[PDB]
């Protein structure tokens with residue numbers, strides 16, 4: 001199975017005029033990074049709706065993962081589900097990004113651009129989709145096997161899923177945020193895996209990335225304490241090989257230098273009064 005190269009993009013998919021666009025659509029940058037990390041009860045309830053819809057779009061596209069299919073076709077499906085449910089796909093026009101989800105095969109760490117790329121037997125593909133509705137975002141992702149995937153790669157996927165769920169299950173108010181990345185990295189290193197450092201989880205609410213950073217590796221210098229009403233992603237990228245990467249000329253696609261495969265899972269989480277609630281569930 002050869003190292004991936006860029007396929008060709010389908011044209012911009014329309015979304016109905018009546019679906020509110022985030023402010024950043026059609027602009028070179030977003031107005032984000034200084035928004036409160038704790039959400040009002042109103043925004044939390046709305047994020048339940050956005051997260052539910054993202055989860056559905058994820059589940060739908062992931063159902064179409066099969067040898068023969070294009071990444072572009074996964075995007076079509078995710079886009080349709082978001083649009084049919086009244087949601088704007090948050091990635092569409094986010095800093096110029098051209099599609100409605102990210103599709104990240106094999107050695108693509110993250111930010112892959114749905115295209116003419118045809119999935120083959122044994123590949124793994126991450127699909128990351130975000131919903132914007134009622135003025136808020138919800139983001140979820142998962143890595144899906146295509147065909148007869150090698151044990152090596154199944155285990156990577158299952159272990160990355162597990163790391164993520166372990167980390168989620170440590171979320172509680174009064175606990176150090178740094179606990180997330182300690183749990184993740186300790187679990188990954190157990191199997192000889194390497195945790196991506198340069199890409200992180202983030203606060204999410206009325207803005208896509210509100211400036212809160214959630215590290216997935218052990219970094220006990222972070223002082224941030226989790227508080228009820230905080231909303232953020234946990235989204236570890238976990239590599240079979242070394243952390244060294246390249247970005248393609250499209251400006252988005254992140255690939256492992258060594259071309260070894262990598263996996264990722266993600267939810268949008270609420271810190272409740274007593275623990276956690278996963279917002280990106282069906």
Ligand SMILES: [K+]
Nearest residue numbers: 104105106108
């Ligand atoms: K990947």
